Amino acid sequence: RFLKVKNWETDVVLTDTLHLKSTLETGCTEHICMGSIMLPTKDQLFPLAKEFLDQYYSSIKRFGSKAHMDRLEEVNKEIESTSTYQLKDTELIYGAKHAWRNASRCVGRIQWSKLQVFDARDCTTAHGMFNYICNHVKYATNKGNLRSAITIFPQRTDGKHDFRVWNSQLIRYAGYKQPDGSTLGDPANVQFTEICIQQGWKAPRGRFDVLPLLLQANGNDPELFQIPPELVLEVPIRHPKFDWFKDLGLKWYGLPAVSNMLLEIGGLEFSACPFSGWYMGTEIGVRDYCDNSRYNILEEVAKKMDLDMRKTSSLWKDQALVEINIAVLYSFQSDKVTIVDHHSATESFIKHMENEYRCRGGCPADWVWIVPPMSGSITPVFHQEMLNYRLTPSFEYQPDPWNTHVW
Amino acid sequence: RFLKVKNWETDVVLTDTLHLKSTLETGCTEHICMGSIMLPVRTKDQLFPLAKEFLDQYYSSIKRFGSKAHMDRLEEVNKEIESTSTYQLKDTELIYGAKHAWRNASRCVGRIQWSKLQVFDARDCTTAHGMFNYICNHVKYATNKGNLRSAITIFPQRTDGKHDFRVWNSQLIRYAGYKQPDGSTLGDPANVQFTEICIQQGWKAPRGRFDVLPLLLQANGNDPELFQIPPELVLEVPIRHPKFDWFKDLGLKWYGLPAVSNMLLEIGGLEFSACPFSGWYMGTEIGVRDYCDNSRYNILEEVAKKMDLDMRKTSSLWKDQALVEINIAVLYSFQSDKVTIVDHHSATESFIKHMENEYRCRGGCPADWVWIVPPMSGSITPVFHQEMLNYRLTPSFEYQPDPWNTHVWKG
Numbered sequence: 001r002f003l004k005v006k007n008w009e010t011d012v013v014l015t016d017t018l019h020l021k022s023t024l025e026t027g028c029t030e031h032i033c034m035g036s037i038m039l040p041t042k043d044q045l046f047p048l049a050k051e052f053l054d055q056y057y058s059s060i061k062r063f064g065s066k067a068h069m070d071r072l073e074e075v076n077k078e079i080e081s082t083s084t085y086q087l088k089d090t091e092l093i094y095g096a097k098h099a100w101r102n103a104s105r106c107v108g109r110i111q112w113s114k115l116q117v118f119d120a121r122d123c124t125t126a127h128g129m130f131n132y133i134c135n136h137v138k139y140a141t142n143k144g145n146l147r148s149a150i151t152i153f154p155q156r157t158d159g160k161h162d163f164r165v166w167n168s169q170l171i172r173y174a175g176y177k178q179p180d181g182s183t184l185g186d187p188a189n190v191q192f193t194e195i196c197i198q199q200g201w202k203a204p205r206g207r208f209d210v211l212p213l214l215l216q217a218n219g220n221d222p223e224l225f226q227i228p229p230e231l232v233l234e235v236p237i238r239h240p241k242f243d244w245f246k247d248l249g250l251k252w253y254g255l256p257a258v259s260n261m262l263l264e265i266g267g268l269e270f271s272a273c274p275f276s277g278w279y280m281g282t283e284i285g286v287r288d289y290c291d292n293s294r295y296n297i298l299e300e301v302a303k304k305m306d307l308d309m310r311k312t313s314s315l316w317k318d319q320a321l322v323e324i325n326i327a328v329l330y331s332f333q334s335d336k337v338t339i340v341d342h343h344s345a346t347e348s349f350i351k352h353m354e355n356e357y358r359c360r361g362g363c364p365a366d367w368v369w370i371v372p373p374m375s376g377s378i379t380p381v382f383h384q385e386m387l388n389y390r391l392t393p394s395f396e397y398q399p400d401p402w403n404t405h406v407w
Numbered sequence: 408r409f410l411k412v413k414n415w416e417t418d419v420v421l422t423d424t425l426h427l428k429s430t431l432e433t434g435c436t437e438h439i440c441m442g443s444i445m446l447p448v449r450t451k452d453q454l455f456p457l458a459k460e461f462l463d464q465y466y467s468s469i470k471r472f473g474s475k476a477h478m479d480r481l482e483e484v485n486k487e488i489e490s491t492s493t494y495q496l497k498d499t500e501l502i503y504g505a506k507h508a509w510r511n512a513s514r515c516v517g518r519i520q521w522s523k524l525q526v527f528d529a530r531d532c533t534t535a536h537g538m539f540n541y542i543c544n545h546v547k548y549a550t551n552k553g554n555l556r557s558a559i560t561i562f563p564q565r566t567d568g569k570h571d572f573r574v575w576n577s578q579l580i581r582y583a584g585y586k587q588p589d590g591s592t593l594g595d596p597a598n599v600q601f602t603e604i605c606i607q608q609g610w611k612a613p614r615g616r617f618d619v620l621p622l623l624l625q626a627n628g629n630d631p632e633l634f635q636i637p638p639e640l641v642l643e644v645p646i647r648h649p650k651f652d653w654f655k656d657l658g659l660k661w662y663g664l665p666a667v668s669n670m671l672l673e674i675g676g677l678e679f680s681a682c683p684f685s686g687w688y689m690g691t692e693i694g695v696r697d698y699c700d701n702s703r704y705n706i707l708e709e710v711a712k713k714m715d716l717d718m719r720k721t722s723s724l725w726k727d728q729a730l731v732e733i734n735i736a737v738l739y740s741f742q743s744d745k746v747t748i749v750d751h752h753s754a755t756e757s758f759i760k761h762m763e764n765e766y767r768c769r770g771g772c773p774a775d776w777v778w779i780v781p782p783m784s785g786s787i788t789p790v791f792h793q794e795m796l797n798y799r800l801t802p803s804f805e806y807q808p809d810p811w812n813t814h815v816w817k818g
């Protein structure tokens with residue numbers, strides 16, 4: 001019930017007590033561990049509200065105060081009366097910072113308390129959503145000096161009036177199945193790209209087309225909007241040694257902005273809550289560029305490098321991987337767009353975990369996600385034992401809207 | 408109940424039923440996952456069910472389930488248990504059990520090989536000099552002049568827990584570590600404490616960077632005794648690089664035979680506390696972990712210096728760059744000397760085919776993702792993208808406490 005985590009590189013042991021406040025379930029049992037699985041009423045609502053306000057008032061050191069009691073009373077009356085309730089600005093901000101604080105798959109959480117929260121609860125139309133989103137994009141991008149931000153649309157009501165950004169991130173590239181048999185662009189977006197097209201978009205059918213936003217307000221049929229091109233900061237990818245790298249014609253965008261997730265605060269569900277920070281280099285250079293089912297460029301890069309691709313044991317794949325990742329980091333830095341390498345990010349996270357243990361009694365972490373997808377054991381997180389559990393406020397997965405939507 | 412795992416690279420979905428046969432626990436609950444935690448005297452009472460379950464599984468695998476022979480065997484084990492309180496395995500059940508422990512070892516990537524295992528039965532062994540002799544034969548058979556063969560040597564089972572056989576070494580072959588007076592370590596930091604025990608027991612330490620440790624062997628609960636493995640039996644590979652001629656001048660070498668000797672084999676409720684086993688190396692074990700962990704030989708700096716990488720900002724990825732070259736070197740050196748080794752691409756690919764085969768024929772393959780994914784280049788290996796289910800089947804290999812912590816010294 002009081003749990004230890006050991007760092008096997010440093011022998012440092014931390015005691016976790018925060019897990020006892022755990023609410024949601026993991027997917028695991030005593031008979032089976034599902035640690036590597038990607039996706040493992042009035043009555044219900046009041047406990048959730050109470051649990052949240054209790055932690056809020058504790059955080060501002062007013063636990064058991066008249067204002068604590070009165071707010072519980074007030075929210076309680078409101079749920080009874082309206083079957084839902086509204087968060088104060090202060091609670092919304094707290095809730096959102098803590099959803100990030102609790103994100104067990106996020107290595108960058110040392111930043112959790114510096115989050116700019118844009119309250120878009122007064123939004124009513126997809127055009128409004130579009131405007132909020134363009135402002136988020138421009139604020140967060142900040143001409144390359146990126147600032148963490150979230151934009152929070154109105155909460156779910158009877159679930160027939162859901163706000164949703166159909167896009168998986170605010171900024172992503174289109175994917176096109178070809179008569180050729182191959183895929184042009186990003187293969188992960190082939191389906192959403194068709195949805196756009198079938199909804200009206202005229203695709204330029206190139207390798208790196210920024211997708212349009214498909215925005216759904218108030219349970220309505222979603223609508224299309226192009227993000228002003230001038231707001232979408234992109235980086236051409238070059239290598240500081242290989243002159244030929246530029247000729248591959250690779251670019252990526254500066255702003256990683258997950259937009260398909262659900263923010264749960266005090267039992268309330270915010271189904272449109274796009275958020276952004278800044279990239280860790282591996283996300284682009286290892287995953288986006290090298291996954292076989294993504295841009296899958298390893299083979300082309302290896303050839304340009306003239307490596308021995310005869311035998312897997314020459315480690316040509318591994319050699320090409322390093323160079324691609326040097327090139328990503330170098331290009332972002334050269335253009336002064338915020339980026340972090342996996343060494344510095346993981347080092348930060350270890351420090352953040354120390355802080356959270358010391359200050360909060362723990363830090364839920366998902367080792368499978370936290371360890372970078374290259375050079376695992378030469379980053380300190382590899383050697384760090386982690387306990388994974390689910391705390392609220394949280395970011396949660398939700399089904400893609402096109403399987404739900406009734407048109 | 409059916410459980411599905413999906414591969415996110417291929418969309419291949421597999422269905423696991425084998426997890427239903429699992430009884431032992433994971434460390435996880437519905438409220439906490441302990442999947443990254445390294446480590447999360449038996450009555451007749453508990454022994455017969457364990458025996459029965461094992462023999463049911465044995466008799467099924469030989470298509471003799473419910474046969475007269477199956478039944479006579481259950482009766483014979485049962486009478487042996489509550490009469491002598493324990494029981495002896497037939498040679499065939501011992502072989503079957505040691506293979507299955509391997510088959511079931513969820514942190515093992517090399518398990519496509521599980522049915523090709525040479526089982527050496529050392530249960531007639533009685534003394535530490537006897538153990539030394541068995542261990543030498545294992546080393547020599549397994550080494551096979553570089554053409555490595557998987558083997559396990561199985562010493563007598565636990566009885567009262569006061570007469571345990573134990574190999575005090577953590578692997579049969581490993582290099583000494585020496586903590587220096589200035590605080591630096593010579594040799595391998597992982598083996599400092601053990602190297603200190605050896606010295607205390609009377610080993611004369613060469614005190615270099617790669618001194619093969621002596622075997623410290625406990626027979627029948629007796630104080631352990633030292634022995635030197637004949638040097639001619641210890642195959643070693645000097646590490647050089649195909650293109651960097653200064654690489655040899657780092658003075659690096661490693662041994663060819665990875666032979667875990669501190670684990671406990673459980674078969675049918677019986678506990679075999681000395682059961683050293685060996686296969687062959689995946690290159691990353693040496694080139695990533697043994698050479699480049701900060702707590703081990705820690706050669707990244709000296710290698711990157713020689714390569715003259717930009718070392719002032721980690722975002723040059725100088726570490727990653729040196730890491731690849733070192734791993735190239737390890738594989739190149741083993742191949743050149745004709746000593747068996749597998750690269751992490753080849754091994755993870757084979758594992759994936761192993762795993763799908765196991766899902767089809769067996770109903771599952773328990774696998775620990777944290778351990779299966781290699782410690783470099785994780786996501787360009789197919790395992791990274793493979794969902795896995797981790798659960799515990801018997802027969803199995805288990806951890807046990809280091810014997811210097813529990814041993815009652817005779818003097």
Ligand code: HEM
Binds near residue numbers: 100106108149
């Ligand atoms: C400040 C810079 C940040 C860094 C360097 C960072 C780092 C990361 C990385 C590397 C991932 C894994 C991405 C993947 O494999 O797809 C991740 C996941 C995540 N981060 Fe962050 N993060 C940052 C900011 C944020 C912000 C601002 C939030 C929310 C306010 C957040 C919430 C999350 C969540 C919820 C996930 C899991 C998403 C999923 O399951 O796909 N992070 N973080």
Ligand code: HEM
Binds near residue numbers: 667686689749
């Ligand atoms: C034939 C070639 C083999 C290969 C390439 C191989 C590969 C590996 C690797 C790379 C590890 C992880 C080692 C570490 O991080 O310390 C491992 C773990 C393991 N393998 Fe194998 N293996 C092989 C044979 C065997 C054999 C013969 C057995 C026993 C009969 C075995 C049982 C295990 C066990 C129990 C572990 C977990 C070790 C631990 O928890 O410390 N493997 N395997």
Ligand SMILES: C[C@H](O)[C@H](O)[C@H]1CNc2nc(N)[nH]c(=O)c2N1
Binds near residue numbers: 035036038368415791
């Ligand atoms: C099957 C496995 O859970 C899946 O590949 C995970 C592994 N670790 C990951 N880690 C991160 N950060 N992001 C991912 O998408 C994944 N994919």
Ligand SMILES: C[C@H](O)[C@H](O)[C@H]1CNc2nc(N)[nH]c(=O)c2N1
Binds near residue numbers: 008382385386445
């Ligand atoms: C804390 C963490 O569980 C620990 O570092 C594990 C990670 N994965 C591993 N994987 C393998 N094969 N071997 C190991 O020693 C480890 N160490």
Ligand SMILES: N=C(C=O)NCCC[C@H](N)C(=O)O
Binds near residue numbers: 257275276279288
């Ligand atoms: N830095 C972050 C968090 O905000 N990334 C979130 C997901 C982005 C994805 N990993 C990608 O490579 O596009």
Ligand SMILES: N=C(C=O)NCCC[C@H](N)C(=O)O
Binds near residue numbers: 684686697
């Ligand atoms: N290939 C195997 C199993 O036979 N490895 C066992 C552990 C070897 C350890 N990783 C080492 O580097 O010494």
Ligand SMILES: [Zn+2]
Binds near residue numbers: 435439441
């Ligand atoms: Zn688990």
